[PDB]
């Protein structure tokens, strides 16, 4: 089943270790992080080095599809 949730997005960026933090927070969809910024992502317990890695892939997703 093709889905746009956060799980598939992390694989695309060669990442799959920060998914657990999203699960324990109640966030399981890319739509939940569409407007979140780098500073807002910090509250999610993710290190700062991962704020630019995950956030960067989210910007490109917007360019491909028009909201």
XYZ file of C-alpha atoms in Angstrom:
67
model
C 0.000 0.000 0.000
C 1.606 3.294 -1.107
C 1.382 5.954 1.641
C 2.849 9.451 2.227
C 3.324 8.938 6.011
C 6.619 9.803 7.762
C 7.900 6.169 7.655
C 8.305 6.130 3.825
C 9.775 9.678 3.852
C 12.657 8.662 6.187
C 13.640 5.728 3.921
C 13.848 8.125 0.945
C 16.417 10.189 2.881
C 18.411 7.026 3.800
C 17.192 7.462 7.411
C 15.172 5.130 9.691
C 16.411 5.714 13.278
C 14.321 8.765 14.336
C 10.937 7.171 13.441
C 10.488 5.863 17.033
C 10.300 9.441 18.440
C 7.338 10.237 16.137
C 5.459 7.062 17.183
C 5.634 7.812 20.946
C 4.403 11.399 20.231
C 1.204 10.463 18.303
C 2.508 11.740 14.915
C 2.374 9.196 12.056
C 1.840 11.263 8.859
C 3.918 13.712 6.764
C 0.963 16.150 6.911
C 1.664 16.578 10.651
C 5.114 18.064 9.873
C 4.259 20.043 6.674
C 4.375 23.439 8.488
C 6.724 22.482 11.385
C 10.039 24.396 11.249
C 13.526 23.318 12.370
C 13.055 24.792 15.893
C 9.580 23.250 16.358
C 10.989 19.802 15.429
C 13.404 20.043 18.407
C 10.563 19.530 20.955
C 10.148 16.077 19.301
C 13.436 14.962 21.099
C 15.288 14.676 17.741
C 18.904 15.942 17.855
C 19.643 19.220 15.983
C 21.778 17.402 13.358
C 18.561 15.621 12.295
C 16.464 18.836 12.099
C 18.095 19.867 8.791
C 18.128 16.301 7.388
C 14.381 15.577 7.860
C 13.183 19.176 7.258
C 15.124 19.442 3.959
C 13.232 16.466 2.449
C 9.892 18.051 3.475
C 10.538 21.247 1.439
C 11.183 19.273 -1.785
C 7.912 17.326 -1.265
C 5.914 20.599 -1.422
C 7.544 21.542 -4.767
C 6.459 18.245 -6.365
C 2.782 18.522 -5.337
C 0.676 21.708 -5.095
C -1.342 22.086 -1.856
